[PDB]
mmCIF file of C-alpha atoms (C1' of nucleotides) in Angstrom:
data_model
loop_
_atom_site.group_PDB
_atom_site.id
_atom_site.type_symbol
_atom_site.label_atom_id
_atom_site.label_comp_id
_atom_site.label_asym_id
_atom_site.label_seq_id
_atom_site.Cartn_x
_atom_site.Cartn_y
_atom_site.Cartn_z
ATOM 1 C CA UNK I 1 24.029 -27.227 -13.381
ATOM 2 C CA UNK I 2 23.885 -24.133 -10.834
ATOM 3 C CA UNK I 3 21.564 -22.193 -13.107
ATOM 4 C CA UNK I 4 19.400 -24.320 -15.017
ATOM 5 C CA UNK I 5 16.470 -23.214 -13.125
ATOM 6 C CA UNK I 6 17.324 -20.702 -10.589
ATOM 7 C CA UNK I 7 19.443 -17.530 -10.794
ATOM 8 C CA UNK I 8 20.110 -14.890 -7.867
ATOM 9 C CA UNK I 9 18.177 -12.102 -8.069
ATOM 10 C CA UNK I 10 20.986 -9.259 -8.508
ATOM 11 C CA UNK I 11 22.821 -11.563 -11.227
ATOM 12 C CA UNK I 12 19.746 -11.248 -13.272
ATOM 13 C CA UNK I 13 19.484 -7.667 -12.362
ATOM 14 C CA UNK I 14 23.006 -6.752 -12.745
ATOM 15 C CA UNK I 15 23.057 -8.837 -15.926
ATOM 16 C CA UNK I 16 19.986 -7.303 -17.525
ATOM 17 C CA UNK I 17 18.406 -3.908 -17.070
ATOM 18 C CA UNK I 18 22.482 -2.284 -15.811
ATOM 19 C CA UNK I 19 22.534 -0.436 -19.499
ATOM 20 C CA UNK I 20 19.340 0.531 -19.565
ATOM 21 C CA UNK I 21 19.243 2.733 -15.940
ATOM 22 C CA UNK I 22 22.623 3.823 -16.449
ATOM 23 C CA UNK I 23 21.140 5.451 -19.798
ATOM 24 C CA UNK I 24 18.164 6.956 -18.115
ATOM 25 C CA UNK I 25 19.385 8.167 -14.936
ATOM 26 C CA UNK I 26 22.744 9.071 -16.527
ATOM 27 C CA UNK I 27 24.331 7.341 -13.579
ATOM 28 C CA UNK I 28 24.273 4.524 -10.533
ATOM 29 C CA UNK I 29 25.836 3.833 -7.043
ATOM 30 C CA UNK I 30 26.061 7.776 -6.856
ATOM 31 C CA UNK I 31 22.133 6.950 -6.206
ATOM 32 C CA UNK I 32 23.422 3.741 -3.797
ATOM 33 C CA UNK I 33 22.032 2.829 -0.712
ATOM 34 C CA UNK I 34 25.451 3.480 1.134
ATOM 35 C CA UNK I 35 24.840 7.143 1.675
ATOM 36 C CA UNK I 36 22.307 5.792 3.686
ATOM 37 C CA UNK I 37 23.139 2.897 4.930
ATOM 38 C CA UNK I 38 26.732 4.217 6.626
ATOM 39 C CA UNK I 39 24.935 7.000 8.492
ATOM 40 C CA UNK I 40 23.210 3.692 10.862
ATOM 41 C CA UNK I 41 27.020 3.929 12.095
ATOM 42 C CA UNK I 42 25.990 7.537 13.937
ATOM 43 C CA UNK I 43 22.880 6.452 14.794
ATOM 44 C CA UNK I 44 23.966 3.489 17.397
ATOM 45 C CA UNK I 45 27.096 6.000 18.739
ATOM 46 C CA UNK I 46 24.474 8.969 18.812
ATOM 47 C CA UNK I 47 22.084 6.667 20.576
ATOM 48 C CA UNK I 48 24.627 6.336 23.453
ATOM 49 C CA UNK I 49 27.152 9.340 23.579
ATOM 50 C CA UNK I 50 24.260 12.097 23.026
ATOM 51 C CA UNK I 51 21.418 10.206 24.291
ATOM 52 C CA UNK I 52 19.380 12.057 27.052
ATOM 53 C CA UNK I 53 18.692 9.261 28.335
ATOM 54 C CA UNK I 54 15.125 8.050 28.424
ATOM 55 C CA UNK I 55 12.463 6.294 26.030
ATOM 56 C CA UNK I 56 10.298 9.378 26.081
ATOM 57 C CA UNK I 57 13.194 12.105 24.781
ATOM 58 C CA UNK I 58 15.344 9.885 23.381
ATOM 59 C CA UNK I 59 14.714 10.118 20.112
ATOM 60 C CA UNK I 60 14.424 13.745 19.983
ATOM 61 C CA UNK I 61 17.954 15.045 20.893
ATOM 62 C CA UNK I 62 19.560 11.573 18.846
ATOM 63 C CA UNK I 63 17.426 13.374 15.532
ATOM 64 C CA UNK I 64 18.360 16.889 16.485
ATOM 65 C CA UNK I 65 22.164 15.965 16.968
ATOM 66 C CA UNK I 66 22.188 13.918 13.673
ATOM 67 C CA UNK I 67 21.036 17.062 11.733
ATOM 68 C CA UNK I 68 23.669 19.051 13.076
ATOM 69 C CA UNK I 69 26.145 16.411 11.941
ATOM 70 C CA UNK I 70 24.927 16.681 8.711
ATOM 71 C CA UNK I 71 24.907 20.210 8.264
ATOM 72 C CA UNK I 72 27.360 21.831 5.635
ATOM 73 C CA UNK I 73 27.536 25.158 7.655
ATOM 74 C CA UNK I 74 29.323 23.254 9.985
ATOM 75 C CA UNK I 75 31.483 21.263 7.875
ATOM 76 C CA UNK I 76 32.601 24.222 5.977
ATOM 77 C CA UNK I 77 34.388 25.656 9.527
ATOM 78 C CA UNK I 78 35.788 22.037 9.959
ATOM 79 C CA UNK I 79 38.162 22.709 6.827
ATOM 80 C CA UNK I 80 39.362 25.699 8.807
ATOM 81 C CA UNK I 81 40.419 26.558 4.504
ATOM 82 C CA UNK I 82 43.516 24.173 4.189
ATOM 83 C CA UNK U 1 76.605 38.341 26.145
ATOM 84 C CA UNK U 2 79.932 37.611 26.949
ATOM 85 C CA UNK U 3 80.660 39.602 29.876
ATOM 86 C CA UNK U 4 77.654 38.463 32.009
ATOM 87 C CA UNK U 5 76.483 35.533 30.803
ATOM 88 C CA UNK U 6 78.116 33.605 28.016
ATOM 89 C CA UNK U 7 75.128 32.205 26.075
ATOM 90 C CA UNK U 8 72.055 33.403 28.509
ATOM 91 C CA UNK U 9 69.771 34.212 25.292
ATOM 92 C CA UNK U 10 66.365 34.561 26.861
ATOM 93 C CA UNK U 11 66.771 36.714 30.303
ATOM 94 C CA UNK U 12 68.387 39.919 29.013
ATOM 95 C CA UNK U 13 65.516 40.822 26.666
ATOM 96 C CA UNK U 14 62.917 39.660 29.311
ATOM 97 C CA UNK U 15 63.729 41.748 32.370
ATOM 98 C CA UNK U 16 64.210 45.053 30.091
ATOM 99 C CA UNK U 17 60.570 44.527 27.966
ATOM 100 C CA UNK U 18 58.405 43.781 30.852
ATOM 101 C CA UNK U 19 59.403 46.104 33.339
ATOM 102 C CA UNK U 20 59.981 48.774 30.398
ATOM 103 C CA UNK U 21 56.541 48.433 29.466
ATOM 104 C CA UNK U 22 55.004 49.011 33.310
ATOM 105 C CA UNK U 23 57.197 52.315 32.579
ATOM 106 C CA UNK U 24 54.479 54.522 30.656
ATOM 107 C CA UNK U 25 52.129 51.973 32.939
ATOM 108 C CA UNK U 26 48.151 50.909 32.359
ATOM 109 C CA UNK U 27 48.914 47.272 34.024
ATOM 110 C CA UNK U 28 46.720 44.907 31.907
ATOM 111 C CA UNK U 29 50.065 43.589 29.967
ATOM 112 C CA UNK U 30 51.698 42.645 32.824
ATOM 113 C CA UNK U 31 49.194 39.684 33.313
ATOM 114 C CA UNK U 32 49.914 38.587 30.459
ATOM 115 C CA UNK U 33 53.255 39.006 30.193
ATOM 116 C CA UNK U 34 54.115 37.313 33.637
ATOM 117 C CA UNK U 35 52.644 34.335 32.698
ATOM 118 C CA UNK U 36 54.005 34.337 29.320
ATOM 119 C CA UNK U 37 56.824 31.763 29.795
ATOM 120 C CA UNK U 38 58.041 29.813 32.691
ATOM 121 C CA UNK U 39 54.476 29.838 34.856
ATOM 122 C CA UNK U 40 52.436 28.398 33.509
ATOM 123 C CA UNK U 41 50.920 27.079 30.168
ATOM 124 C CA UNK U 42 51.063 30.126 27.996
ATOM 125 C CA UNK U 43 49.538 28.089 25.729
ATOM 126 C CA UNK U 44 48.213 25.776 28.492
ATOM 127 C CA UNK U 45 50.673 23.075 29.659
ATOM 128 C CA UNK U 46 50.779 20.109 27.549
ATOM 129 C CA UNK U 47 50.146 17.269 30.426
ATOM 130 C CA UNK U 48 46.521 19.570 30.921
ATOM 131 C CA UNK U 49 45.892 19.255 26.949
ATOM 132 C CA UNK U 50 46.919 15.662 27.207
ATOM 133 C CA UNK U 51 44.441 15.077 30.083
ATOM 134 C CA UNK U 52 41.734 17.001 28.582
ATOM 135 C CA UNK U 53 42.378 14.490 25.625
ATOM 136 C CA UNK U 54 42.641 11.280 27.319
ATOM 137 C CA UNK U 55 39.884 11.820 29.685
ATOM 138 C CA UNK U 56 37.321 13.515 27.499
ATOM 139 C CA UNK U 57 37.866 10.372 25.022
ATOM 140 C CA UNK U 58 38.885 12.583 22.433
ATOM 141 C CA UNK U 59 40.144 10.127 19.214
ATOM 142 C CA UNK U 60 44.000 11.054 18.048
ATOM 143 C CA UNK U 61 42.901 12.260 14.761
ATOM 144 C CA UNK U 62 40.004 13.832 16.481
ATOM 145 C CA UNK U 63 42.118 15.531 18.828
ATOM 146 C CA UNK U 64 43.961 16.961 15.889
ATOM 147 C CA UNK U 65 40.857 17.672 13.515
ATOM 148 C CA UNK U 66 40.056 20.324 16.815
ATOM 149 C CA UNK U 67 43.804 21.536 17.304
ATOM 150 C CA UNK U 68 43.707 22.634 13.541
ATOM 151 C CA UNK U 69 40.192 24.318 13.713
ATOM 152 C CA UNK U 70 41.026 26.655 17.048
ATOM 153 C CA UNK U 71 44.313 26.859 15.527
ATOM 154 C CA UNK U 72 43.164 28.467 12.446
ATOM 155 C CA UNK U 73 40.176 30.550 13.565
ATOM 156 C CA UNK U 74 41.225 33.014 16.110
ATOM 157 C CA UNK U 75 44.373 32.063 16.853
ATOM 158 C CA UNK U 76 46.718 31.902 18.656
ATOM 159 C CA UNK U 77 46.195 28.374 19.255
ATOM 160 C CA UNK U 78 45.533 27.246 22.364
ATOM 161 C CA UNK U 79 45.844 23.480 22.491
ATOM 162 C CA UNK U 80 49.430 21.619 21.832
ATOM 163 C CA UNK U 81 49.962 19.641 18.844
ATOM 164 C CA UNK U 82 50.182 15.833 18.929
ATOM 165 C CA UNK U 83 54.024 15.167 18.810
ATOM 166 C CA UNK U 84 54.739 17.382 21.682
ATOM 167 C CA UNK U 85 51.728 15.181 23.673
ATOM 168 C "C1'" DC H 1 35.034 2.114 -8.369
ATOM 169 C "C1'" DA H 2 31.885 4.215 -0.270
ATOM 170 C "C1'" DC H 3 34.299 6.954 3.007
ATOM 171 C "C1'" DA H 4 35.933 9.072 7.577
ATOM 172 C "C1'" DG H 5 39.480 7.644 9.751
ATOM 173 C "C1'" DT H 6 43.029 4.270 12.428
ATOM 174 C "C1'" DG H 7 48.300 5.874 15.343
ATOM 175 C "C1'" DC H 8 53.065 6.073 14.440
ATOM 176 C "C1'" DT H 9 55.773 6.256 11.059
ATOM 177 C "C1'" DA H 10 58.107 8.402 7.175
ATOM 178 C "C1'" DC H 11 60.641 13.264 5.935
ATOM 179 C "C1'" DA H 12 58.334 16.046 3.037
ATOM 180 C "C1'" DG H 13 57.790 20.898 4.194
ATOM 181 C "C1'" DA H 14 58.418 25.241 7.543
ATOM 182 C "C1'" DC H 15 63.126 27.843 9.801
ATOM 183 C "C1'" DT H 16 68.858 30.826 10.353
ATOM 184 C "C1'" DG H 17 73.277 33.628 8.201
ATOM 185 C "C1'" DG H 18 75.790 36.604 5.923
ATOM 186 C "C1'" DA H 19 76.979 37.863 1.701
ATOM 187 C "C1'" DA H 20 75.159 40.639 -1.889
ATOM 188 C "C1'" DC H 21 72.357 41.117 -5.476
ATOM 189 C "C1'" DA H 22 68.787 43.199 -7.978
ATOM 190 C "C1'" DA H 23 63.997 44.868 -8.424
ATOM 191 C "C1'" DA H 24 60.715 47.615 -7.052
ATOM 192 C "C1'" DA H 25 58.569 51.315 -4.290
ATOM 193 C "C1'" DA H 26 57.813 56.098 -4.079
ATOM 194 C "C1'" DC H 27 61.056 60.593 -2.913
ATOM 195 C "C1'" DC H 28 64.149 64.012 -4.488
ATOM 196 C "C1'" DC H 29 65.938 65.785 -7.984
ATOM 197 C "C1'" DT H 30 68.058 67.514 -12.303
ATOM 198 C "C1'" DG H 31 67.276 67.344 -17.266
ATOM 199 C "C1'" DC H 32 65.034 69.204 -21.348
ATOM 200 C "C1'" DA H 33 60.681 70.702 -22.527
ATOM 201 C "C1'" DG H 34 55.312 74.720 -23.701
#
DNA sequence: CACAGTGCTACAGACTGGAACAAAAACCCTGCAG
């Protein structure tokens, strides 16, 4: 009665081509959007905590201080080795 | 022990090891050595560490994540460890 | 089977002491050897 004529999109996706992909790309959700997605998180603190702050530079050190984030360099003295 | 004191640990190596070292004397440990226990910090004094959290806005688990870097890398730590905030 | 945390809790791990064991390190030695 709920799907005679209409289905979601994502049920039909997630009902149909799931096998297939998972064959070809030999794996998915390691490809997700949430490695992505999550990182939005940094972007509203980054746009208040390191902001200059005007429109004009704004962007600028907000970019800058997210690649630093992300570097591994970095991350690899953050483990200070167990 | 007995004789002097009774239990006074601390005090009878002190005055001997400072002093002793001034003995055959370039000064530069005696800085270091004065401040070494009762004045003040040596680390630095835990109600500076716990301002210097507080008021920076440092999170707990931040505050930690830090401790254990400067901790491990050259140190020595500096910074007081969160039970003793 | 997202992931970096979220503080305070839990008590896991880090400590002494003599009493004595053992193993190992690197010397000296004496032993039996050309």
């Amino acid at each position: 009665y709920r799907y005679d004529g209409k289905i979601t999109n994502y049920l039909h996706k997630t009902l149909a081509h799931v096998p297939e992909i998972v064959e070809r790309d030999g794996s998915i959700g390691a490809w997700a959007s949430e490695g992505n997605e999550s990182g939005n998180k940094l972007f509203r603190r980054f746009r208040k905590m390191n902001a200059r702050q005007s429109k004009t530079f704004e962007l600028e050190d907000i970019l800058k201080h997210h690649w630093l984030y992300t570097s591994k360099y970095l991350q690899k003295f953050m483990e200070a080795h167990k | 022990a007995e004789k002097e004191e009774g239990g006074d640990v601390k005090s009878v190596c002190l005055t001997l090891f400072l002093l002793a070292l001034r003995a055959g004397n370039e000064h530069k440990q005696a800085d270091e050595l004065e401040a070494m226990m009762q004045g003040r910090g040596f680390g630095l004094h835990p109600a500076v560490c716990l301002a210097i959290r507080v008021n920076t806005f440092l999170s707990c688990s931040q505050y930690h994540k830090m401790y254990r870097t400067v901790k491990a890398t050259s140190g020595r730590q500096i910074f007081q460890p969160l039970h003793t905030l």
